[model samples]
Each structure stands twice: as structure tokens, then as C-alpha cells.
Target chain A: GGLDTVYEIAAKRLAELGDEESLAELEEYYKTFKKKLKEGTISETTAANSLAIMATRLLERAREKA
Target chain B: GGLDTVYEIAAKRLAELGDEESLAELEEYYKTFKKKLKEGTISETTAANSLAIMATRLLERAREKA
Candidate 1:
């Protein structure tokens, strides 16, 4: 729906993945987003969206692992 | 001062910490906040504040490392 919805789902997924085995992917993605933001290659909204996507992907991975 | 100010500083700090160092602390903090939010142990405002604090702390660590 909106970014808030995206964030809500992401937050919920993070909660579900409490005992997630590996956060290596999410960590790497976040770092890359931060780096791109600093390099002026992306806007704040873009960075936030990237984070949401990363969270979603993490949840997907967790689900597959489960 | 305000949450926006806190967020702004956090964003700037994240930008600065681009190629810096480890984000293990920030990641853990973010995960904790999200878990609390899902468990109803914390409000959205509280979760956001925690994130701002995490960002600030990350910047502090980055500075110290630099």
C-alpha cells in the first residue's frame, strides 16, 4: 500500500526472524545502501525503500530456511 | 531536539559512515527494536527513537574508529 505498510511488514518480519540464522545478506545490503546514500547516488526515500526490500528478502530467505 | 532532528542527524551520520566499519551493533539494535515493536512492548515512536539512538551511536563509533 504505502511506505508505512512496507515498514510494518518489514518490522513484523524482523520479529518473526528473531532467531534468524544469518543476517549476512541484510547487513551487506544495508551497508551498500548507506554507501550509495553517502555517494549521492540515491535519495533518502530510495534508501528507505532499499531497506524495506532488504527486510522483505530476509523474510523470504527465513521462510525458505524454516 | 525533535525526532526529525534526531532522524536528520542519524541520516547524516549514516551517510558519513559509508565505508567506515562494522554495523553489528546497529543491526542488533534495529532487530531488537523491531522485535519489541512486534511484541507490543514498544510504540512506533519508541522504536524510531531507538533507531535514531542506534544511528547516533554508530556515528560515534565510526568517529572513534576514525
Candidate 2:
């Protein structure tokens, strides 16, 4: 299987830290991403990238907050 | 009267990052701590200490892991 569903939770947490609109988009992405994972079409890089992009957005927000 | 219960969950998670035994103990502590919270006998420092103790335990484990 994949790493674990827990990893998806981690990804979602990262995604939630972005802007509000982006957070909404990532919520949608999370649903579809989980569906894709269940359908066996998900790659590790894809999953990781989804999370990384969210994390980058979060980082930008943190810089602004500072 | 105190900070949000969400903060307690945050504390518990920080505690759970340690080894198995400490994690188990923290689990027990979390139960009692939550009970105290519901009963309204919990002080902020007591709540925070319960979490901080667990967090300290986890940090020790992380050092071991490293």
C-alpha cells in the first residue's frame, strides 16, 4: 500500500496552513487525493508534492506573519 | 476559564513522540487530565505540566532516536 493514511493527515495539516482560499482548494484536493489513493493511481511524488506545495504556501504565510 | 481544550490535545501529541513506554504513560495521563478538565478541577499549570512532562519525556526519546 502507500505510506499510511496518517501521512495524508500530515499533508492536510500542511495544506491547512496556507491562505484561506488555498486552504479551501487543498481541502478539495485532499478529498480527491484520498480518492485517487484508494483507486491506486496515486504516486508518492504526487502525494509529497501536493503536501510540499502546501508547505511552501504556509511558509510564505509565516514570513508574512513575521 | 482556561485556554481551549485543543491546547491540551496539542500537548498530548507533543508527549506521544517519545518511545513506547512513555507514550503509554502519556496516554494514561491524557485520560486523567481530560477527566480533570471536564470536572473543572484542572489548573492551567497542572494541565500544562501534565503536557510538559510528557513533552520532556518525548524530547528525551528524540535525543535517543537521534
Candidate 3:
């Protein structure tokens, strides 16, 4: 759920799990990822893996804060 | 690369890494996955994770065969 997640419903679930600051960070990460994807420096699957890892990393932070 | 792989160029790489039978099995899995995704029975992230797992599993098989 990398670029697709930006279009899909994962953001809503992400919002449920984190606060505004974390959401902003996620948005920033997505922007950089999109840039990388467009540059062809990263493969689509690699982007997906990065996105997946980002989600879990934020989830861990949110869990710790909670 | 889940359903995205079907559209993206992952198929080419998969073909590079595996034989005809493996590709056929992958195609079958994609069909089932797409069906599940469209039926509203699976979340997008779940589908992505499944695809990721599927890729690794096939990679394992290819590795073992090699």
C-alpha cells in the first residue's frame, strides 16, 4: 500500500491509529516515496516494502505513546 | 507487488526467476487475490501483505529448485 495506499482507504485506518504530527510525518514520507518512484530510482515493489515498513514503524511509535 | 505486480513489470522479473509452471501458479494466485480484493472481503494492506508474502514464498521455491 504505497502509492495505492495514498489513493486507497489505508490512510483512514492510519488516522485512527496516530495523531496529527505522526500523520504529517507519514504524508511527508509518502511525498518522498512518490518522488523516488517517479525518478525510477526505486522499483514499485521496493516502494511497497518501504511503505509497509513505514506503516509498522509508525504503528510502533503510536503504540508506545498510547 | 500484489495486483500491482500484474500491471507493473514484476511479471517480467518473476518470469526471469522462475519457469512456466511457477508463472502459471502465480497467475492462478493473482486471479484468486483479485477476486478477493474486488469482493470487499479483504483490505488493501492485507492484500498487499499477502502479495508480498506470496512473492517471498515463490522466491523460496525458486531458490530451492535452483
Candidate 4:
């Protein structure tokens, strides 16, 4: 549930940002994360952390543009 | 560009946190910020700062959950 919520939010944000490249990458990552969750390879906290890391990367990119 | 990027990142983080109340509030805030940007009522730096604030809030929420 948490994973899906994050995925949807990430996708929405990507659309808003108009970042095709990162959006594509996020889609790929989301797929892998989903699979990993199903396989018990990653916990909910890990999923959240991964999402946070991606967010920080996005923020860094934005900072570079500034 | 910076505004959009930060917006995306914040949205992703919010989703990761699974906070429905904040998520909805963010959407509203994003719309207002975009409007403000168009009206030149807010600068890029301010937009980025707002995004950062949201991210920080989300992080705090996550920490509380931990």
C-alpha cells in the first residue's frame, strides 16, 4: 500500500515537472520496487527510503539548475 | 524548472510517507505556487524553499513513525 502510494505520487510529480528522462527512470524503478516488495526482498521502510533517496536526487538536480 | 523539479521530489516523498492529509494539502499548495509563479508573486528560490519545507515536514513525519 505504501509502495503504491509513493509510486502514484512520484508519477504525478514527474508529469508536473515535465522531466521525461527521470520520469522514465522512476517508472522502471517503481516496477522493480514493486517486484521486490512482492518477493520480500525489500521492506516498507526500505521502499520509503529508496523513494526518499530518489527525491533527494531530484532536489539536487533542481539545485544545480539554480 | 527548479520549481517543477522540487515539486516532483516533494510529491514523491509525501507519497512515500503515506500521509493522505499532507498529500492533498500539497496538491493544493502546488497549484497555488504555480499560480504565484505565473503572477511573479514568488521567486524560484522561494518555490524551492517551499518544496524543501514540505520535504522536511514529510521527513519529520517519517521519523515520528520510526
Write down the TM-score for model 3.
0.47
In candidate 3 chain B, what residue range of length 10 has the lowest lDDT sum?
Answer: B5-14
Where is model 4 more than 4 Å wrong at Cα? Answer: A59-66, B1-66
Off by over 4 Å in 2: A1-66, B1-18
User: Model 3 over residues A3-56: C-alpha lDDT tens digits?
Assistant: 554323335535776655666777787778888989999865566656656755
Error of 3 at A4 (Å): 2.4
Judged by lDDT, which candidate is best? 4
Question: Which pairs clash inside model 4?
Answer: none
By TM-score, the better pick of 1 and 2 is 1
Q: Where is the poorest 10-residue window by lDDT in model 2 chain A?
A: A1-10
Which residue segments of model 3 deviate by more than 4 Å? A6-10, B1-66
> lDDT of candidate 1?
0.56
Q: What is candidate 4's lDDT per residue for A8-37, written digit by digit as tens? A: 555666566667677677778778887888
Q: What is the lDDT of residue B14 in candidate 2?
A: 45
**What is the CAPRI rating of model 3's predicted complex?**
incorrect
Candidate 2 lDDT over B34-53, as tens digits, reads 66557655544445443454
Cα shift from native, residue B48, model 2 (Å): 1.8
Cα RMSD over interface residues, candidate 2: 17.1
lDDT of 2 by residue, A1-66 (tens): 122232333345445554455455555666676777778897643553454345335434543554
